[PDB]
């Protein structure tokens, strides 16, 4: 957690539909953007902190 791994997503297609459908992801808390409109709004970059 202290050395959180950073990944960048860009110049591609962002598939949040795949992420929205897996059962193990019990905790899905989103703020600023609705979970159902993720693929509609277009953002320059996506930053994943794992």
């Amino acid at each position: 957690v202290y050395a959180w791994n950073r990944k960048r997503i860009s110049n591609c297609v962002a598939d949040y539909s795949v992420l929205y459908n897996l059962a193990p992801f019990f905790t899905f808390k989103c703020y600023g953007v609705s979970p159902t409109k993720l693929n509609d709004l277009c953002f320059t970059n996506v930053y994943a902190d794992s």
Partner: protein
């Protein structure tokens, strides 16, 4: 018409508790109409919660909050008040006081004005 709505209340609470909201109206409108509150859950649509006539004669409440939320009116401040209890997790949302400018209420679809969003959060 020119009506301004000032909302007050909201914050972080424990489940099953009680909190404080109140809306005041100022300006001038066509007539003395109804006044209600509207709930917006994050990621959901905006739905009404209740509606009270100005003279506190008849009250209308949603089926999902009946027997748990109530709304009354001031006698010397022209500010509508509402009380609630037994709050559950789904109540964490944004509330807006709205003014309906007609004498007799038929349905909640046509809304005249909207107030600033008051976010209330309940959790453990």
């Amino acid at each position: 018409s020119a009506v301004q709505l000032q909302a007050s209340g909201g914050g972080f609470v424990q489940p099953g508790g009680s909190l404080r909201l109140s809306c005041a109206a100022s300006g001038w409108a066509e007539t003395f109409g109804h006044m209600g509150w509207f709930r917006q859950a994050p990621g959901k649509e905006r739905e009404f919660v209740s509606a009270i006539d100005w003279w506190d004669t008849v009250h209308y409440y949603a089926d999902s909050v009946k027997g748990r939320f109530t709304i009354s009116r001031d006698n010397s401040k022209n500010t509508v008040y509402l009380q609630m209890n037994s709050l559950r997790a789904e109540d964490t949302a944004t509330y807006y006081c709205a003014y309906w400018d007609m004498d007799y209420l038929q349905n909640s679809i046509p809304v005249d004005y909207w107030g600033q969003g008051t976010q209330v959060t309940v959790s453990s």
